Amino acid sequence: KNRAARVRVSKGDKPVTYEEAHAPHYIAHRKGWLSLHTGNLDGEDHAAERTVEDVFLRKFMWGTFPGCLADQLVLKRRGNQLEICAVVLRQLSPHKYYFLVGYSETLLSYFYKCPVRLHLQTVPSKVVYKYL
Template sequence: MWDTFLRRFLHGTFPGLLADAALVKRRGNLLVLCLLLTRGLPPAKLHFLGGYVETLLTHFYKCPVRLELQTVPAKVPYKYL
């Protein structure tokens, strides 16, 4: 249930920029979110949105949240065999 909320929140915060599904890791009390984004926004706006997500989710979950962002030029085509 919490992962669904996180994925929907990230999809709404970064509309059309998610190149792949968000990866949610829990390390003890720390929540780590790994995102692969396309380069659709200027870097300053991406940094602002990253800080916004970390701050809001830290207050919401009452535990530290860290966001790891990576950008790619375009959506990465994956082929699952």
């Protein structure tokens, strides 16, 4: 059986978002890519660099916002601009959210030498697409 990036139904109680509820063979069909850059296009270079940067950004935003990210990040690259769009819970205080936004933006901009921006969309709770 295929065990890759799938959520197995056990009791119809586990809540899953839209991303988790869809198997990989649905990426081109029901859930667009979580990252958008030109590196993987035809004739374009630096695909590996973009992949490594995306992995580091995901692992860094996951730990910088512990228990706050509702779903996986969305990374967009436009020229040298990098935009991280994150769905976040409303558990933490807004002061801490703004502190983390400023800190993460400045640190990522200085680390990757690109004008990083971070857009947070707040939700009361993790949106449940279905139960498994």
